[PDB]
Amino acid sequence: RPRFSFSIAAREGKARTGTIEMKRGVIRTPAFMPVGTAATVKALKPETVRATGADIILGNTYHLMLRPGAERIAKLGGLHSFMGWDRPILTDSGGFQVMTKQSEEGVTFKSHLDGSRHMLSPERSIEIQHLLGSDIVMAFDEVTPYPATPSRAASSMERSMRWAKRSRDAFDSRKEQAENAALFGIQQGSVFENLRQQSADALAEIGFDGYAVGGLAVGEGQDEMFRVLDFSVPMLPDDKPHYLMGVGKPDDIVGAVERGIDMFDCVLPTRSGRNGQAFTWDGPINIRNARFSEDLKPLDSECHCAVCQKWSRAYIHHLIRAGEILGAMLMTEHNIAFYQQLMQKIRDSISEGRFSQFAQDFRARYFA
Amino acid sequence: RPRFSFSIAAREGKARTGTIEMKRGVIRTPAFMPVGTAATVKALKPETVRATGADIILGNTYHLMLRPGAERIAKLGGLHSFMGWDRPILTDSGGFQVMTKQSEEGVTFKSHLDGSRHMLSPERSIEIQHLLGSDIVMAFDEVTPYPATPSRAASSMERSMRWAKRSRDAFDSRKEQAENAALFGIQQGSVFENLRQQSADALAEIGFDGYAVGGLAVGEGQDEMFRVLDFSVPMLPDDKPHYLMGVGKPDDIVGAVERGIDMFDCVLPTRSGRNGQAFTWDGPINIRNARFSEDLKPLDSECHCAVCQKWSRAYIHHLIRAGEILGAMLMTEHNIAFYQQLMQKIRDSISEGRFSQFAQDFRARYFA
């Protein structure tokens, strides 16, 4: 397999479906990436993560660099070997989570576990992601808060572009990394069309394997998010993957794919699972609700996952109310499987030229 | 399969190995029963419990009757169907955990979850175990504290024998239960040989499918426990299974089998697992210890379990220190598999007439 190859098999309007080929495997797109925080997708073995249909997972740099430490993970063989996931892993750059003394060089911060002091910069972030053995490396950026004034948004986007060039040069400086991994750049510019355009132009001039739309996971509401994607995604190179960071709910995903996004990650299916929220085609339910205490149906009556083949809402209700680990295990497996099934339906419908219809049908039912 | 058949295939001194056949499956003895507290073996799916080699699990009556409730579990189809374990389940009678107003009728108590008031008596305990659909039902007894004076020990053993007859009659009164499940009686008498003998005589006169040695899980120390088993187990009918309740550590098990015990349950491998203790043939280790932070070996280098095939001490160290659910999952799976492997080694060595040697070798290494 090549280091990185993105091929588009089918389109419908702005939506695309295709594959990214990398040394560790193929990623079907649009793709949803379960999040491993601290070298585990919470409450699942990697084989279970794979069984749900996931082709790639995300690792959080910030948490890994504090515990167990990047150098330690490298000494033990790299993140894949450490956690037992042998397919591609995308790592974030760590910047969002650090968001403290900031400067053009980078940021220094105190560990929220320890009070220990650490530093992150484009160069150190790229180095950490190398030590982890990440297949898709994210450039280090500066987070713009929402809302941001035009001047702050411009200053921060400009700094991010300077840091994107530093990230590119650090990545390219390291032979093993440049030959085996991919590097994605992140577009900033908040809600402002002109800044999004300057950011897209700067990133394309530098040149990346894929392009993320940053600065949207951050409180703006779905209508505004969709409005920003409307003009922002067409600014990115069409022939490379487009990744919307930190999104999101099933309806967010469907709308974002309609706007040309190919890759997603979110902690919702994992986190929501442990707290009692299960995704269904008829919308999310909270399994702790008393109405489920004697409900013998599965979490979702169309879902193909092993949880829905084997256990009832009533049993999972009991487990979650009782605080049992198996409750978290089953809810998380189901929610990740549901997300994978959603992406598969999205991929098939685009391939078949019926994605618009699928989106309309999906929304009608999910919100009924 | 018959309702209940215990066959002894081989003996060596007081130790026996054989099988108990029941409608839901065969139990190899000596047997270790993982404990399901609240209709789950903590942090494991039933298929994983079975994969470790377990033939039967224990359910806790006291917890189940408070949450989710016995009547509710019966309405949902019984415990097997509720939790997805289709092999035999032994339920305890609930009395140990309740141990509050006591009388010859039974005990009334306040829920430690709710302050709600509940009642337990030989008849209600047997009824609850029926509603759960238990395959091996334990007679309801009164717990004797340690230490106990001779007079208190006698009074409480005598009450337990009266309650054992009530348990027998309640069980026999219910057709579906009498035809499909088995009933075990519990010997009491604290450390006193004469009371243990009167208790054995009373229970044999009543007649049970198996006999538990009660009142030993309770603070007395291994030497005293072994001394009491020395004289107590030979008092029980030889042709029925002998169950030592709430024991225990691997060395406890080996010694107890040398004294004629066939069945064990304990929460150690589950509970100890979640707290960082892993069993090895070289003795228990606490995986949180800093010495394991870069140790690439499996938990135990002879263990055949899936955890030891796939993940390092270093990774599990990180998971447990980080408070991750997968840490509890992996430690529990390994510890239950280790216990099952220990019972298999015990069964083979008795069958092969080399159990004395195995016990000596096991102790030499485990305590080195």
Ligand SMILES: Nc1nc2[nH]cnc2c(=O)[nH]1
């Ligand atoms: N690094 C980074 N991570 C994110 N997650 C959500 N939004 C962002 C972003 O703008 N930058």
Ligand SMILES: Nc1nc2[nH]cnc2c(=O)[nH]1
């Ligand atoms: N019911 C009961 N359960 C136990 N668990 C440990 N010891 C005992 C006992 O003596 N009686």
Ligand SMILES: [Zn+2]
């Ligand atoms: Zn499901």
Ligand SMILES: [Zn+2]
């Ligand atoms: Zn093991």
